[PDB]
Design a protein around this ligand. Structure first.
Ligand SMILES: [Zn+2]
Lengths: 100, 337, 100, 45, 50, 180, 172
DNA sequence: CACTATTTTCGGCTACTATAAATAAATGTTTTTTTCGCAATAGT
DNA sequence: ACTATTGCGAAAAAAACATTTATTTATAGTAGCCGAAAATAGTG
């Protein structure tokens, strides 16, 4: 999600705006790393590696704890359950498996 | 294409009842029925290796695929035109895909290709002009700096009112386009200054260094630009105030002839000096050379007692012929054993 | 370096609309609010005929290469165009999505 | 005319062709075609 | 494998940095996840089950 | 205007029938400069006529630093006079000229991107690698470069006459779209 | 309101701009004192002993002036001029031995200083041609000042060392 | 209120690719291929 | 263990072939490092 410098929530695409452009509703992966450049060793913050597609109504999405006014501005249904991905357009969900 | 009765040239397909028969328009005879639908290796190994590498930097620079596949043909011909031999592998592909980036007129510069691989800009710039000259690419888009202003704002993380600061920046740049600076100057430089001037008037996000993380140009050569527009015309009008509504051209002063000044029928053929009269001045004696004699070049000669003295220091700075000697002596040893 | 163009409404006998072109609009995008029947192209899509030819680094004869490849509305019943939007994907690449 | 309108900027504008895909007054990049002025006909059953 | 190819060089052994080329492998965790979710078949290695 | 492009460097090579040894021409000279690890030949420099001499261990020799044309043949044969001290034949037969460079002044500021858009099929440039433009002219097979200051260096003449008809060719072609 | 540096509004996160810019001058400050001083499991242990530092993205920033040939030459002194003009007067023009005279100076910029003296003082180089004679006899001290470092007569001593070496081939 | 010290403020300078176009012996490497060695592996 | 059969691995090398060595014009353009000077602010 967020960086450590700005310490903001994030700036993120809306999910309904994402589902009309056939995009993957994702969130970036940030790590901090320490390594040996040379004569001195050096630690760097906020290295981006990739983008994590994250389910709706999770605490990392902007739909978490809305008041049908932000969600009015983000034109999502309040009665939607959530719990599904928006990879490249079509909305998919992982089923609950079982085994022995 | 030709009917059998009326020799009709146009054919219409009927999709109404899904027979999908093809009928000529004039007389109505069917043309067809029952449609039938469809339900070196080392040369290959080196391109499949190279297929990885031009795709490699496209992930880094956020290059969409229609540039990477378009530059693949430029590498395909330059391999065939014997351009790939001798040069380094990473240099011949980094010069390749920039040409496709220029045809798209993208925001990407050239200096970002040298960035990770830790060379100079004109290191891989040297192989670039050898590509366009040898492979005869005549047409090319100009390096338009107006693209760079729009891309700089996103990583500049400025205020939410970012559209007005670009619309003001481009009207500054269009006013500065009619001005007389960027003709031999740098497109990254002058586009690193006009967006610096527009953001100055509304916020203090100007810190002379945060834009250098974007534009990648020295803090002092952009300050030269901040002085350069001030002294031509109508800058003092808008130094302090004066909303961006004027339409003026002013005088024409490229800052090149001022320093030249501050320092200070066609032409007939039989008036310019010739060439073979200068060739025929002194005689062409092949072996003899005693017609250019003088007294200083005759005295241009060694010192006789310093012949041993000059070579003593010359052999005192010898370590090559020391190291060279056993290379010849091991050559004798390696020849026998 | 060739795009795809939306040229439309070829005309005949002092009028724009052919029987296939009463609902195709000025820009080649089907006009919002009117019905369509069998035939009656609603998005006109034109493709370059040099789809895989090698790039000759010149501009000598590029003026007439767009052959038509439209999408015909099939179906047995007349339907209406509700609205149409156009946008960009994650790469710089345009989209056309109409909802009948 | 009454050409392309934006989603939430909702600003009437006439895009010139093959030039941009975004709207003015906002960086939002989804825009709608407005309804024509042309008459249309219906029934009442 | 993208660093030891460089570390076997005499001249490029002092000034070399690693995370200048972190972005070349960055697009192998996005298109791996977005394929596994779009096409619902997860090909693993440690268990080898399909 | 009646301006003439002055000529700055004239280079020339001749053949030599005798093979050179680096010991006997460097260790008893005055401008002794030879680093075998750095450069495989001996240089020497004279204040008059301010030319520079360069040899080859195979025997051959090439001169540069000549301002005038007749002064090149003066300097090249004085370079042969030192080789007469050593027991070498030191002969010169063919005084070939292949490389004559000139500089000029025009003294009115021009645009260059205007002709780079019009005459772009045959001449072009890159701005961020080099400030000037690179001009091609295959009718005498001459290539050269222009600036934004007007002043145009006429580089690389294989023949001294070859540039003169090329010199006044481009200047009326350049003067168009004059600034105002 | 001149465009050069007024402090005038919010300027968010300006300190990382200020911290890196002020630290840049300290970077060249260590490189000045290096010049004047020249005038005069087990692998991880020393990796712990190395300097640990946090990276701020403004510090490592690169421009066109990066990763390129050349550096800033030390400007010449009048003390160097008298040892320059004396060897310039004895020999014709020999870059080789005078590079060793100035120990940390290289072959490249002493060639450029010959080019530097051409336009600057064009009359001193005309006397350099004309000065082909024994000068004011003070160079004999500078003759043996060249000969006091590693005192070994190379006309006679620097022969036997290859005679030692060429004997080794006849053994082997 | 006024000195003293300093942080700018401003060139000043010095370099430095370029460019072609020679000359040329290196002087690099590249691909392409071929050679040659060792370890890889498994059966002595 | 040790010797033999194997595949690759690394390196030659070949042929090419662009990349370096020293010239001279500048011209405008960066870019780095250095004072040169000048105002300004702490503090007497
Ligand atoms: Zn808008």
């Amino acid at each position: 999600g967020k960086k450590s410098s700005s310490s903001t929530k994030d700036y993120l695409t809306p999910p309904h705006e994402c589902r009309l452009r056939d995009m993957t509703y994702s969130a970036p992966i940030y790590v901090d790393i320490e390594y040996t450049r040379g004569r001195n060793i050096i630690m760097h913050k906020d290295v981006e590696i990739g983008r994590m597609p994250i389910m709706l109504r999770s605490n990392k999405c902007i739909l978490y704890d809305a008041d049908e006014s932000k969600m009015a501005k983000l034109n999502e249904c309040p009665l939607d359950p959530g719990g599904y991905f928006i990879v490249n357009g079509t909305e998919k969900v992982i089923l609950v498996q079982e085994q022995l | 294409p030709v009917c059998k009765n009326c020799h009709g040239t146009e054919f219409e397909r009927d999709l109404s009842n899904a027979n999908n028969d093809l009928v000529c328009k004039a007389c109505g005879v069917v043309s067809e029925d029952n449609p039938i639908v469809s339900e070196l290796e080392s040369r290959e190994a080196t391109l499949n290796n190279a297929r990885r590498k031009l795709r490699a930097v496209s992930y880094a620079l956020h290059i969409p695929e229609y540039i990477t596949d378009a530059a693949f043909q430029w590498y395909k011909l330059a391999l065939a035109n014997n351009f790939v031999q001798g040069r380094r592998s990473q240099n011949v592909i980094a010069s390749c895909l920039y040409v496709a980036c220029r045809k798209e007129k993208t925001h990407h510069m050239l200096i970002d290709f040298s960035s990770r691989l830790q060379v100079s800009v004109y290191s891989i710039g040297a192989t670039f002009l050898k590509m366009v000259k040898k492979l005869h690419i005549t047409e090319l888009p100009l390096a338009d700096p107006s693209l760079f202003i729009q891309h700089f704002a996103e990583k500049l993380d400025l205020a939410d009112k970012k559209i007005k600061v670009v619309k003001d920046a481009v009207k500054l740049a269009q006013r500065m386009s009619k001005d007389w600076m960027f003709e031999g100057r740098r497109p990254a430089g002058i586009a690193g200054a006009c967006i610096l001037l527009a953001c100055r008037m509304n916020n203090l996000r100007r810190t002379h260094t945060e834009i250098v993380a974007v534009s990648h140009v020295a803090e002092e050569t952009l300050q030269q630009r901040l002085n350069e527009f001030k002294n031509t015309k109508a800058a003092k009008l808008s130094v302090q105030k004066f909303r961006e509504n004027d339409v003026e051209d002013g005088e024409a002063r490229p800052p090149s002839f001022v320093k030249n000044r501050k320092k200070e029928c066609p032409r007939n053929l039989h008036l310019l000096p010739t060439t073979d009269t200068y060739l025929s001045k002194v005689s062409d004696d092949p072996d003899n050379l005693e017609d250019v004699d003088d007294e200083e070049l005759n005295a241009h000669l060694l010192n006789e007692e310093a012949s041993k003295l000059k070579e003593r220091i010359w052999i005192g700075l010898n370590a090559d012929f020391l190291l060279e000697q056993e290379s010849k002596r091991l050559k004798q040893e390696a020849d026998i054993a | 370096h060739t795009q795809d163009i939306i040229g439309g409404m070829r005309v005949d006998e002092n009028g724009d609309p052919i029987w296939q072109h009463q609902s195709l609009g000025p820009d080649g995008l089907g006009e919002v609010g009117m019905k369509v029947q069998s035939g009656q192209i609603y998005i006109n899509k034109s493709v370059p005929t040099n789809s895989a030819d090698a790039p000759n680094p010149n501009n000598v004869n590029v003026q007439t290469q767009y052959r038509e490849a439209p999408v015909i509305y099939r179906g047995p019943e007349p339907s209406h165009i509700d609205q149409v939007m156009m946008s960009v994907s994650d790469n710089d690449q345009a989209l056309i999505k109409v909802l009948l | 005319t009454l050409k392309y309108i934006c989603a939430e900027c909702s600003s009437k504008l006439s895009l010139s062709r093959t030039d941009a895909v975004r709207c003015k007054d906002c960086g939002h990049r989804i825009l709608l075609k407005a309804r024509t002025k042309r008459l249309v006909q219906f029934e009442a059953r | 494998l993208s660093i030891d190819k460089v570390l076997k060089k005499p001249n490029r052994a002092m000034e070399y940095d690693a995370l200048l080329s972190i972005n070349v492998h960055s697009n192998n965790i996005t298109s791996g996840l977005n394929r596994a979710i779009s096409t619902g078949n997860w090909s693993l290695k440690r268990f080898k089950m399909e | 205007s009646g301006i003439v492009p002055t000529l700055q460097n004239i280079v020339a090579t001749v053949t030599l029938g005798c093979r050179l040894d680096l010991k006997t021409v460097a260790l008893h000279a005055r401008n002794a400069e030879y680093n075998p690890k750095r450069f495989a030949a001996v240089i020497m420099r004279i204040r008059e006529p301010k030319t520079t001499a360069l040899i080859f261990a195979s025997g051959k020799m090439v001169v540069t630093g000549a301002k005038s044309e007749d002064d090149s043949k003066l300097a090249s044969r004085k370079y042969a006079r030192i080789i007469q001290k050593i027991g070498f034949a030191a002969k010169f037969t063919d005084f070939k000229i292949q490389n004559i460079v000139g500089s000029c002044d025009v003294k009115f500021p021009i645009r260059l991107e205007g002709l780079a858009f019009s005459h772009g099929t045959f001449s072009s440039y890159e701005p961020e690698l080099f400030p000037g433009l690179i001009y091609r002219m295959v009718k005498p097979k001459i290539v050269l470069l222009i600036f934004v200051s007007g002043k145009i260096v006429l580089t690389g003449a294989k023949q001294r006459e070859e540039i003169y008809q090329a010199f006044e060719a481009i200047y009326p072609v350049l003067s168009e779209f004059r600034k105002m | 309101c001149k465009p050069n540096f007024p402090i005038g509004q919010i300027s968010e996160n300006f300190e990382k701009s200020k911290m890196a810019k002020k630290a840049k001058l300290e970077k060249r400050r260590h490189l000045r004192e290096l010049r004047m001083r020249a005038r005069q499991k087990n692998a991880s242990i020393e990796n712990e002993y190395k300097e640990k530092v946090d990276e701020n993205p403004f510090a490592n920033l690169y421009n066109y002036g990066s990763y390129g040939r050349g550096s800033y030459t030390d400007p010449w002194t009048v003390e160097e001029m008298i040892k320059f003009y004396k060897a310039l007067s004895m020999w014709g023009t020999d870059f080789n031995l005078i590079s060793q005279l100035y120990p940390y100076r290289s072959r490249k910029q002493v060639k450029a200083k010959f080019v530097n003296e051409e336009k600057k003082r064009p009359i001193l180089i005309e006397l350099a041609l004309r000065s082909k004679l024994p000068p004011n006899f003070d160079e004999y001290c500078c003759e043996i000042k060249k000969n006091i470092g590693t005192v070994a007569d190379f006309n006679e001593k620097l022969i036997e060392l290859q005679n030692e070496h060429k004997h080794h081939m006849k053994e082997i």
